[PDB]
Amino acid sequence: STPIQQLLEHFLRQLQRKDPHGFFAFPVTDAIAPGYSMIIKHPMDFGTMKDKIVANEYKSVTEFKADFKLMCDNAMTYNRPDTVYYKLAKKILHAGFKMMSKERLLALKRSMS
Amino acid sequence: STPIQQLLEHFLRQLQRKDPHGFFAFPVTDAIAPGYSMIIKHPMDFGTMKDKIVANEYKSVTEFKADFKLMCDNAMTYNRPDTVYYKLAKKILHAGFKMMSKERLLALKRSMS
Ligand SMILES: CCN1/C(=C/C(C)=O)Sc2ccc(OC)cc21
Ligand SMILES: CCN1/C(=C/C(C)=O)Sc2ccc(OC)cc21
Structure with a gap:
């Protein structure tokens, strides 16, 4: 492995811990979510x-x-917005962008000098 | 855990992997290496x-x-210099400082931007 891969694996693990039920663990498809493909054109999930x-x-x-x-x-x-899925997405997004702040990335970045 | 701890743990695993027998894994003792304490002023090992x-x-x-x-x-x-301990020490010293080279850490630096 490489250093950047280890840093990204750390971040990803912290984020997955905030989704204990695995809502974001695998690709959502039309087989489970009617009309998904035509609403969500750029799918993404933790597994990808x-x-x-x-x-x-x-x-x-x-x-x-x-x-x-x-x-x-x-x-x-x-x-x-009433669904657990929308509600959790809003919360992890906030937390995730707070853990990968501009600031925090500069502090961790002064550690490598 | 923290990002800096995860980065250092990565470096340490890479280095320890070059010492499969654990020559450097734990502090050398006088019972094993006579006069070690009297010769080595500042002992260090992977476990510390x-x-x-x-x-x-x-x-x-x-x-x-x-x-x-x-x-x-x-x-x-x-x-x-003829001992396995001296030879492995010289080899991992060179390898480790190429892995934590100035260049490699500054490239890793730009990746966190
Ligand atoms: C993977 C769970 N999950 C969603 C996740 C996200 C992030 O959108 S969307 C959704 C709709 C139906 C379903 O099967 C009942 C599951 C389902
Ligand atoms: C623990 C291995 N090893 C050394 C370790 C370092 C890092 O120096 S020095 C030493 C001397 C004798 C011995 O038993 C033959 C072992 C011994």
Whole structure:
């Protein structure tokens, strides 16, 4: 493994702990969610993100954050605000962007000098 | 855990993997290596470094590199050049400092932007 892969695997684990029931663990498809494909054109989930880490397809924390943000946007677009799915997506998005702050990324970034 | 701890744990696993027999895994004792305490002023080993990581006592990769270099210098000071201990110490010292090179950490630096 490489250092960036280890950093992204750490972030991903923290985020998955905030989704204990695995709402975001696998790709949502039309077989479970009517009309999903035509509402959610850019699907994303934790499992695809793990595969992209393993495949070393992320070159930055910015790219990783964008996939995480996409996933939570999709969940808030498709599900109505009354659903546990929409409600959890809003909460992990807030927490996730607070754990990968500009600030926190600069503090961790002064540790490597 | 914290991001810096996870990064140092990664480096430590890479280094410990080059010492499958655990020459460096635990403190050398005078019962095993006569006069060690009298010759080696500042003992160091992988287990203590892991203890300091968990205890979040490293504030830089530089500080971490300093304990690693200490560990390998100690082994080459106490053990004669024909011994497995001296030879492995020299080999992991070079490998570890190529893995925590200035360049490699500055590239990793841009990845967290
Ligand atoms: C994977 C769970 N989950 C959703 C997740 C997100 C993030 O949108 S959307 C949803 C709709 C139906 C279903 O099967 C009853 C499950 C379901
Ligand atoms: C624990 C291995 N090892 C050394 C370790 C370091 C890092 O120096 S020094 C030493 C001397 C004798 C011995 O038993 C033959 C072992 C011994």
